[PDB]
Amino acid sequence: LPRLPELFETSKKLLEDVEVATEPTGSRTIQDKVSKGLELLEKAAGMLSQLDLFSRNEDLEEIASTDLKYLMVPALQGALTMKQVNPSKRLDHLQRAREHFVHFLTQCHCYHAYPNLVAMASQRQAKIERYKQKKEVEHRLSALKSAVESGQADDERVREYHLLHLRRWIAVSLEELESIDQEIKILKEK
């Protein structure tokens, strides 16, 4: 019996497959995974609406640690929409994807000699810390992944693990939205 957790995880792995796949993304096999992930996430979202886990438009601390991951559904939906290949409908995809990424963002609850040389110095390492962070984040996620997916991590690690995934999805959704609007604008310029 097709259950929510299974729906999510399958879809998640399916996307991770597609993002790493090396053949043209227009490949029969890739497009199949994309189509399947879209379909399962549609079903999952359908169920998430029934459950209404985050009805209360506040909280966050108050969400069950393992429910946290369902927050990322609209994000996975946007990412997979953006992997479809059908030139003649490209704009439809953009607009579908745009809805998901926003829809995501509006549910995440996630929110969150001297002078010139000094600025140069402070403005330099800034970018090094930005790279670092990016690296640390990914390193941490990969360290916890197994245990969290296995049910072997304590609640602190599980909650930490998903909030961190959430942040990552914020940045990603913001960039994607920027890219989407740029391309949509050209496609509608008449």
DSSP per-residue letters across 14-46 = HHHHHHH--S-TTSHHHHHHHHHHHHHHHHHHH
176/124 same-domain check: no
105/124 same-domain check: no
25/107 same-domain check: yes
120/145 same-domain check: yes
- R_g over Cα of the chain: 19
46/1 same-domain check: yes
Output the six-digit token pair for 38.
């879209």
Which CATH number do you get for residue 126?
6.10.250.1140
DSSP output for 80-104: HHTT---GGGHHHHHHHHHHHHHHH
Within 8 A by CB and 6+ apart from 109, the residues are 54, 59, 60, 71
57/138 same-domain check: no
- Reported structure resolution in angstroms: 2.3
Could you tell me if 110 and 163 are in contact, meaning their C-beta atoms sit under 8 angstroms apart?
A: yes
The domain in which residue 71 lies consists of: 1-113+153-190
50/134 same-domain check: no
Torsion, CA 60, CA 62, CA 68, CA 73, rounded to 10? -60
DSSP label of 106: T
Output the six-digit token pair for 184.
């949509």
121/134 same-domain check: yes
Q: How far is CA 4 from the centre of its chain?
A: 18
Q: What total number of domains does the chain contain?
A: 2
**Integer distance in angstroms from the first to the last C-alpha of the chain?**
48
Reduce the DSSP state of residue 110 to 3 states and report it: coil
161/90 same-domain check: yes
Reduce the DSSP state of residue 63 to 3 states and report it: coil
DSSP label of 68: G
